[PDB]
Amino acid sequence: SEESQAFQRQLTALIGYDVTDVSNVHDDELEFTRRGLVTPRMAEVASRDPKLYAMHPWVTSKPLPEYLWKKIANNCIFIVIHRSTTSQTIKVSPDDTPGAILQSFFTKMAKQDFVLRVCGRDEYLVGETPIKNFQWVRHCLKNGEEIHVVLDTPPDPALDEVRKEEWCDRKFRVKIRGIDIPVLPRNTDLTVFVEANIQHGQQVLCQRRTSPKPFTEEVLWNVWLEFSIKIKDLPKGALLNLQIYCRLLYYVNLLLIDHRFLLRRGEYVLHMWQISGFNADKLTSATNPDKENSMSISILLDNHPIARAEMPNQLRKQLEAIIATDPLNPLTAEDKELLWHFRYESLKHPKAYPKLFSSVKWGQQEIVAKTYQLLARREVWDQSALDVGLTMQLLDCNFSDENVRAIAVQKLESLEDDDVLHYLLQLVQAVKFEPYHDSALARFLLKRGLRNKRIGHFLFWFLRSEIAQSRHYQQRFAVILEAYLRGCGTAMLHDFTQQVQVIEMLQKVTLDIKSLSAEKYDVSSQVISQLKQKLENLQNSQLPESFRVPYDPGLKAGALAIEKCKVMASKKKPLWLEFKCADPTALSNETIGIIFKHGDDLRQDMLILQILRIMESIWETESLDLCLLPYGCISTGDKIGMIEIVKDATTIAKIQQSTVGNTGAFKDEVLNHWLKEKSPTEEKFQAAVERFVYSCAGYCVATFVLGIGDRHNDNIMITETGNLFHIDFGHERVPFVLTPDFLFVMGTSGKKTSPHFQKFQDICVKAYLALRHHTNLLIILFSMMLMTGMPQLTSKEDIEYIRDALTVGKNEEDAKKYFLDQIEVCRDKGWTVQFNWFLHLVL
Numbered sequence: 104s105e106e107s108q109a110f111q112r113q114l115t116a117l118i119g120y121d122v123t124d125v126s127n128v129h130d131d132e133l134e135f136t137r138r139g140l141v142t143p144r145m146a147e148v149a150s151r152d153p154k155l156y157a158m159h160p161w162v163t164s165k166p167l168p169e170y171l172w173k174k175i176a177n178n179c180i181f182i183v184i185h186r187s188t189t190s191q192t193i194k195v196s197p198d199d200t201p202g203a204i205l206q207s208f209f210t211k212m213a214k215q216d217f218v219l220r221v222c223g224r225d226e227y228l229v230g231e232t233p234i235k236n237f238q239w240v241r242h243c244l245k246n247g248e249e250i251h252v253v254l255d256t257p258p259d260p261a262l263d264e265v266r267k268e269e270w271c272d273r274k275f276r277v278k279i280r281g282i283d284i285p286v287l288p289r290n291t292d293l294t295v296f297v298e299a300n301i302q303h304g305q306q307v308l309c310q311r312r313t314s315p316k317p318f319t320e321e322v323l324w325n326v327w328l329e330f331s332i333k334i335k336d337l338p339k340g341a342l343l344n345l346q347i348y349c350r351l352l353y354y355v356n357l358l359l360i361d362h363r364f365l366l367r368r369g370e371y372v373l374h375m376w377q378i379s380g381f382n383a384d385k386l387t388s389a390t391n392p393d394k395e396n397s398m399s400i401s402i403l404l405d406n407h408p409i410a411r412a413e414m415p416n417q418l419r420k421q422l423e424a425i426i427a428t429d430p431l432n433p434l435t436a437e438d439k440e441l442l443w444h445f446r447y448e449s450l451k452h453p454k455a456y457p458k459l460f461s462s463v464k465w466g467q468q469e470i471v472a473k474t475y476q477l478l479a480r481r482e483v484w485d486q487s488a489l490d491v492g493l494t495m496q497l498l499d500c501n502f503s504d505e506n507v508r509a510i511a512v513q514k515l516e517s518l519e520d521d522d523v524l525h526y527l528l529q530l531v532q533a534v535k536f537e538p539y540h541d542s543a544l545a546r547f548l549l550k551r552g553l554r555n556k557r558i559g560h561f562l563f564w565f566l567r568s569e570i571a572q573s574r575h576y577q578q579r580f581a582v583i584l585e586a587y588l589r590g591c592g593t594a595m596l597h598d599f600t601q602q603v604q605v606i607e608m609l610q611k612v613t614l615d616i617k618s619l620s621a622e623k624y625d626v627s628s629q630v631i632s633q634l635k636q637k638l639e640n641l642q643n644s645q646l647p648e649s650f651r652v653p654y655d656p657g658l659k660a661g662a663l664a665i666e667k668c669k670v671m672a673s674k675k676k677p678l679w680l681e682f683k684c685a686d687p688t689a690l691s692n693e694t695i696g697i698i699f700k701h702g703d704d705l706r707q708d709m710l711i712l713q714i715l716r717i718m719e720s721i722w723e724t725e726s727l728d729l730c731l732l733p734y735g736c737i738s739t740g741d742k743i744g745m746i747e748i749v750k751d752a753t754t755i756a757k758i759q760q761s762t763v764g765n766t767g768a769f770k771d772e773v774l775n776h777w778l779k780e781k782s783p784t785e786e787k788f789q790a791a792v793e794r795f796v797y798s799c800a801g802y803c804v805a806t807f808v809l810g811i812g813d814r815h816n817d818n819i820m821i822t823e824t825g826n827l828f829h830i831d832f833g834h835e836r837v838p839f840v841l842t843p844d845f846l847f848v849m850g851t852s853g854k855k856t857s858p859h860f861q862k863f864q865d866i867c868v869k870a871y872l873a874l875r876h877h878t879n880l881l882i883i884l885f886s887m888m889l890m891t892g893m894p895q896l897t898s899k900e901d902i903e904y905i906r907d908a909l910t911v912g913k914n915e916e917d918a919k920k921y922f923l924d925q926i927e928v929c930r931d932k933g934w935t936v937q938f939n940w941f942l943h944l945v946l
């Protein structure tokens with residue numbers, strides 16, 4: 104039971120979806136999946152070390168990069184320690200463990216066991232890890248900052264307490280009975296038919312149509328559709344995709360083999376997803392909850408069970424060629440049969456595996472058999488070093504086979520939380536391509552999230568983001584989330600509970616303000632008053648005392664700095680909110696600044712940001728820093744989210760608006776003055792010039808690769824301290840933005856060269872060819888991003904942008920050349936496409 108039914112309401116209200124609800128299901132898969140997950144939850148709960156769990160030490164086995172060993176000129180590191188305005192600085196060896204450091208500290212003083220917490224954060228320096236390997240440390244040294252730690256006592260694991268739990272040979276065929284809708288769209292007499300496909304990872308196996316019939320609110324064929332495939336030749340995870348044309352208006356899917364390995368039988372009345380008017384919402388096994396407005400379709404099943412000599416030379420080379428080839432290069436029939444015939448050779452090359460397993464006639468019993476024997480002798484794959492790009496490739500929409508997919512997930516098991524975090528978002532999205540609710544991958548996210556509060560925290564927001572936006576996938580995700588929460592342990596349930604109230608509160612406010620200045624560029628006096636009064640109304644009895652900042656879970660925000668909060672001057676009306684630190688042990692009055700925004704789909708931004716982080720760590724692997732500023736951003740519901748404000752930064756545009764602020768002339772010297780005036784010492788200035796040259800360079804390459812490089816001034820920002828960065832990725836060309844104002848900081852004005860600019864192309868090109876060394880990873884992530892993150896998209900040309908840009912199949916010379924030309928376009932065009940935003944105000 105009873106007090107255990109509150110818990111459920113807690114869960115549902117925490118999730119944003121009621122998973123005990125059974126009104127949008129035609130079977131028990133979700134229920135079954137709720138049951139299936141108890142063990143892997145309990146298992147992981149049971150085996151986690153309570154102390155290290157409560158402190159969630161954020162840590163990495165990566166080597167410390169060159170550019171930070173450079174920053175330590177003494178093989179020794181300073182750490183200020185505090186007890187209560189009593190503090191001493193300690194020389195420490197980069198290889199010193201924390202316990203080891205406590206040894207030397209107790210030694211120092213008086214002439215039990217406490218723990219090193221970071222000043223101002225919910226971050227601890229604990230565990231047999233040399234300090235060189237805690238992230239905070241690496242982050243402090245990056246920025247030229249000191250390292251402030253208070254000594255306090257550990258958090259009681261009691262607070263992580265988890266609740267008690269006490270839980271034939273026949274051809275296949277389908278009777279299309281007919282379809283219904285209540286209200287008919289365009290109205291004038293058109294014509295309509297049903298298309299029934301037998302699908303397996305977007306490979307199509309058979310297809311049947313109906314004769315068409317006049318499009319009216321009710322249409323009844325009552326036909327058998329005898330397909331070409333044999334019942335027994337059906338593979339697990341095969342979808343019966345049902346589609347409607349007149350062209351494509353609606354689609355829906357049914358697993359032909361249920362989660363119990365049972366051929367699917369009987370009557371079904373399926374409510375169908377309308378078209379927007381390829382992508383991952385097409386694949387779903389879910390039905391439209393909206394029974395009242397959706398088109399639907401009746402059908403019937405009743406058809407039970409089921410569960411090397413020497414290769415030539417020039418063929419080996421055709422083979423190696425095929426294998427050695429981007430994920431988007433499609434395979435000829437000729438290729439596929441080659442791969443299949445020489446599968447045992449193909450098997451020694453882990454890079455072949457995606458190509459190889461998509462050369463499988465999955466519509467043949469006998470061949471899948473062989474394909475499993477093939478997976479049996481996995482020596483080489485098991486032993487290969489982890490390649491995430493490769494691994495990821497095998498979790499995309501192209502692979503429905505449960506066992507292919509699961510070897511990829513084997514490979515992830517060896518990732519440390521550091522990397523789990525990098526890829527967490529994409530991996531969560533990759534759930535959408537899983538044929539069944541319960542999957543190896545789902546279970547793996549579950550483990551890793553429960554094992555580590557950082558992953559757990561981000562897992563929560565990532566699943567919740569989707570649950571609240573997508574009906575296609577909310578059911579499945581809601582089940583995974585519920586699984587998580589039942590293991591994360593009441594500490595976090597309270598945290599998530601705080602957090603969820605705050606962002607529901609603050610979105611209420613966000614939307615109410617849009618109502619009050621329609622478009623009208625200016626923001627009425629009236630507006631700001633009301634914003635002020637609401638936030639005051641909120642703070643006085645309703646808002647929590649403090650709360651974790653979802654995009655950065657080490658930060659506890661306290662009260663609002665109402666004075667500093669405002670509505671932004673947008674066509675949308677985002678909030679500029681700022682909070683005090685709730686941590687009194689913090690080093691500053693410097694606020695936490697968060698922007699809330701409705702009107703853009705931030706799921707996209709989230710993705711782009713995550714790819715930015717990935718690029719930054721690729722550059723880590725060649726001892727390269729380009730100071731990208733992939734600020735925090737978390738989507739939270741329908742076209743609405745939050746955004747980390749970056750301290751001390753303005754808009755390239757505004758730096759123009761200041762001096763001239765014209766309707767839109769444009770000047771080249773202005774940026775460089777703006778730096779001087781924000782550099783209290785001329786040598787710090789050269790650091791701004793420094794940071795800028797990198798940041799510019801970073802964003803130049805990145806932005807180009809993603810093809811989001813032609814942007815307006817207003818959507819680029821720089822820090823008072825040189826760090827340039829792009830924003831707002833919800834929104835003649837130019838490849839990327841290299842305006843003449845930038846180049847004047849690089850000591851050039853219209854076609855010359857100079858110390859820092861030589862440096863600029865040097866870094867740029869380094870950066871560029873460095874990402875080409877991870878081509879397949881970027882291609883797979885990008886392609887997935889578009890499939891899980893976008894509007895509709897061409898399953899060739901939208902995606903194919905990024906191979907031409909990564910200049911696939913090219914030696915480093917051509918490529919370097921290519922990139923350099925992409926610079927020279929921005930110097931042909933100078934201010935031209937910048938200038939052009941304005942003009943089309945009327946075109």
Ligand SMILES: CCCn1cnc(CCNC(=O)Nc2nc3ccc(-c4cncc(OC)c4)cc3s2)c1
Nearest residue numbers: 677694696700734747748749750751752830831832
């Ligand atoms: C953060 C504490 C207050 N503060 C301390 N220094 C400043 C100077 C002003 N700094 C900024 O405005 N920084 C910004 N950072 C971002 C990051 C992202 C976005 C953004 C990204 N995407 C979509 C957007 O549309 C609203 C906005 C805007 C800003 S402004 C403000």
